[PDB]
Design goal:
Length: 271
Amino acid sequence: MIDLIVSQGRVADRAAWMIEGAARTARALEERYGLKGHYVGEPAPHADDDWSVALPQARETLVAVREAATESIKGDNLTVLVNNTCSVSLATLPVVAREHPDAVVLYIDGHGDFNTPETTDTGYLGGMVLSGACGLWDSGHGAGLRPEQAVLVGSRDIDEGERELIRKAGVRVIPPGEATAQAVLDAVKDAPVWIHIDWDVLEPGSIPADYTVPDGMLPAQIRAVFEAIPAERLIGVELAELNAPADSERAEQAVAVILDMVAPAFDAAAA
Ligand SMILES: [Mg+2]
Ligand SMILES: [Mn+2]
Ligand SMILES: [Mn+2]
């Protein structure tokens, strides 16, 4: 079955509606699969604070997400986190790597999220998530994820400094035009799999752009990844960074696309 965990506490959010987007996504999953989410954390307004300020502010939410994710990973169900920001994964990825040292993390994101305190241009915690989990810097919530076990999927237009940190650490990158289901399966080999998704990986707007080559990943490419990962091997899935206001038509349309992408994996786990 499925364990649904929903972050609703601020974790460095610089966007206005990602807590609301997480809630609406969770609601759609509850209605479709007959689930009741475990909601963690208290909302707070977005702000452009430095990671050194935002990170301590988020400690209570991160600790609570860590303990909820730990219980789920140790059990028998599919762990599904609907997270406001990628930074929630500073708490979950060290758990994944500890409980499943052989897991491959598919970090599906238009960005690398591999900055350190020394290299970040913007101070944003969300751009430091994968490097933190891999121990390039100390988030205060552990590390232990081998960069050799992390695969960035859909990332593009990466700052050349950050791209060299990624390369030196051994993180593989599969850009959108290479990110077929088979390309992703070849990267995973026989490993159990954790999927982390930042929706900015998706090609914006124009749903049937039939005569142009997309720069981002298409919804069909994400679905093909969820179709291809065997249910027995899937440890869990994180859905992050839907920026859409509560009760907006936009949020209703967005979660319908999300449910279509994740259905192969979630339908199988619910059986
Ligand atoms: Mg499980
Ligand atoms: Mn991200
Ligand atoms: Mn991103």
